RNA sequence: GUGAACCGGAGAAGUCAUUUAAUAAGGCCACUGUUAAAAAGUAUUCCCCACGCAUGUGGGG
C-alpha cells in the first residue's frame, strides 16, 4: 500500500471484494453472497447477467506492508546558500581585486 | 495533494508551477524509464515562469509565444506548417 | 534556536546608553543614525560566524527595538498568546472584548515590516496591568516562521486555550 | 567587598565596630544597631554640601531591618566648567624608545595622546541657610566650611595627567555675590 | 471504445443616510578614567637598462 504526503493516515481494515468461487463441491452460495449485475455480454445492445460477489476484508501491515513515499516535497523557492571560506569564492575575490 | 499555500516569496501561479515542476521530476526519475523518451514543451508568456530551471533540462523547450508553441507542436506531429 | 537565545542574552546584558540609542530609533529605518547600525551590527553579525542559524535581520531589528521601548524580563513559559488571553479574561464581555480582540487579531493578517505599532499597542496594555516577564525567545521563534499555516494556527489555538481555561 | 558603596562620617566609625565586639547581641538586633548608626552619621562638612543616597538591598535584605531617613540634602550646586570660545583639540604622537640595541630600529610602543588648552568659566552655588541646616544649627563650622571652599577652589587643579602637562595655573578673576536667587553668567559666552 | 458515448444553470441589481474620547499629573534623588612613554634610525633600498675599473654615474617604477 502506497503512502501520500508523511502526517496523512491510512485505513487499518481495508475491504475487498472479489467474484464467489464454487469449486464444484460447496454448490451453493452462502447467504452473505449478493448478486451484482456486470456481467456483459454486448455493449452496443448493452446487456448484463448477476453474478454472486462476496465481501471480505485485510489488515494493513499483517497482509499488505505499508509503502514508503517516493522523494517528493512541496516546492518552495531556491533560498540558496552562503558560503565564503569556500576556496573558489576566495580565489574569485582574488581575481576581482 | 498536498494544497498550495503562498508565501511572500512567490505567488499562487508560480507555487503551482513549481509544484507541478516537481511532480513531473519524480515521475521521470520513476516510472518513465529508457523504453521511449517523453517529448514535451513548456509555454509561458515571454518566459514569465520557468518549469524547473536548468534541473537536466525537465522541459526540452522553454517557448515565450503562443504561435511558437503551436508550430512546434505541429512541427513534431507531422512537420506541417 | 541557541542563536535566537544567544541574541535575547546579548540583549538583556546592554547597558542604558545603547538602550537609549534604540528607544530613539523606534519607527526607524536602519540606513540613518549610524550609531544604531553600528549597534546591531554588532548584536548581530556573531551569530552567524558561531551559530549555523540566526534569526532573521528585520525580525531581530523589530525585537531589538521593541525590547529597548518595553524592557521584559526573559522567562520561559510567558508567550505573548498566554498573557493576552489571561488579560482579556478578565475584561467586560460586551464592549471592552471585542475591541482589544479586534486589536489583537489584526496583528495575524500583516508581514514582518509593519507589525511594529500593532505590537506596540499590545506591549502597552500589556504594561498596563504591570507585567513583569515575556518569553523574547518564543516570540521571535514564531516571529521567524510567521509565513507557516500551523505557527499562525498554534498562535490562534494557544490565545483560546488561555482565554477558555 | 560590599555591592554598593557607603557615605558615612569616619568619627562614627569606631562605634560601628563596637556593634561587633560585642558578642551578647544577636544578629538581627546589631544588624539593626549598623543601621542605626549608619544612617544618623552624617554630620560631617563633606556630606553636608555634596549629601547622600543610600539603599539597602531588598532581595538580600532580612526581614525585621528597618531603616531610618538616609537621604541628605545638598547644599552645592557645582556647575560643568566650559571653555569661552570653541575647542581646539590636538593629537601628539608618541613613542617608546628602547635602551639596549636590536637589529631593527625603534621598537617600543606607538601611540597617539590627546591634549587642548582653554580659557574657562566656572560656577559654585552655596545655599547658606541649607549648609547650616545640614550641620545641625552650627555657624562657626559653617563659616569655616566656606572659608576652606574658597580657599581650596580657589588654588586647586585636577590631578588628570599633570605628570606630563602640569598645567598648575591660578585663575585671574573671581566673582563671589550674595543673592536670594541663584542666577548664572555663562550666558555672555 | 466502461449503465457508456453526444451533454453550460443562465439572464437583473448602490447598504444606505447621523455623530469631538473628553476631563488630572516631576522621574526623582549619589558619583575623579585614573596610572608608563625620544619619531627616531648608515654600513647591503624591492625592482628594469647604457658604459666601466670603478671602489659608479644617468634614465624608468
Known sequence: ?97 | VRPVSVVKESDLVEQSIGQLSNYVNDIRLGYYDEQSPVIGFWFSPNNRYPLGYKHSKLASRNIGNLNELVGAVLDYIGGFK | ?165 | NTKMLVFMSKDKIKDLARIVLDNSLGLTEAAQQVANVIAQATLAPDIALCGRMLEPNDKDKDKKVKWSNTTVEAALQVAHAISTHIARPEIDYFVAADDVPGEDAGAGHIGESMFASACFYKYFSIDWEQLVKNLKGDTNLAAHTVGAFLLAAAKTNPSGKQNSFAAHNYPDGILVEFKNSPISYANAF
Open chain 1, 1 to 97: 500500500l502506497q503512502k501520500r504526503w508523511h502526517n496523512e493516515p491510512l485505513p487499518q481494515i481495508l475491504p475487498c471484494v472479489m467474484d464467489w468461487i464454487p469449486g464444484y463441491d460447496g454448490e451453493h452460495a452462502p447467504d452473505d453472497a449478493e448478486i451484482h449485475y456486470d456481467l456483459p455480454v454486448s455493449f452496443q445492445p448493452p446487456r448484463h447477467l448477476p453474478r454472486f460477489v462476496i465481501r471480505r476484508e485485510l489488515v494493513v501491515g499483517e497482509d499488505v506492508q505499508v509503502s514508503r513515499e517516493t522523494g517528493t516535497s512541496v516546492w518552495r523557492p531556491k533560498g540558496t546558500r552562503a558560503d565564503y571560506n569556500n576556496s573558489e569564492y576566495k580565489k574569485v575575490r582574488a581575481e576581482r581585486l
Open chain 3, 1 to 165: 534556536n541557541r542563536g535566537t537565545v544567544d541574541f535575547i542574552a546579548s540583549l538583556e546584558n546592554l547597558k542604558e546608553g545603547d538602550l537609549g540609542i534604540l528607544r530613539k530609533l523606534r519607527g526607524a529605518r536602519l540606513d540613518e543614525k549610524l550609531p544604531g547600525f553600528d549597534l546591531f551590527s554588532a548584536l548581530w553579525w556573531p551569530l552567524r560566524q558561531k551559530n549555523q542559524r540566526a534569526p532573521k535581520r528585520e525580525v531581530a531589528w523589530l525585537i531589538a527595538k521593541l525590547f529597548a521601548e518595553f524592557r521584559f524580563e526573559q522567562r520561559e513559559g510567558a508567550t505573548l498568546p498566554i498573557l493576552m488571553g489571561g488579560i482579556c479574561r478578565k475584561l467586560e464581555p460586551k464592549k471592552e472584548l471585542p475591541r482589544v480582540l479586534a486589536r489583537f487579531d489584526q496583528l495575524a493578517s500583516l508581514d514582518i515590516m509593519q507589525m511594529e505599532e500593532p505590537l506596540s499597542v499590545i506591549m502597552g496594555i500589556l504594561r498596563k496591568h504591570q507585567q513583569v516577564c515575556l518569553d523574547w525567545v518564543g516570540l521571535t521563534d514564531v516571529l521567524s516562521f510567521w509565513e507557516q499555516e500551523p505557527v499562525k494556527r498554534e498562535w490562534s489555538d494557544s490565545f483560546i486555550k488561555a482565554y477558555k481555561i
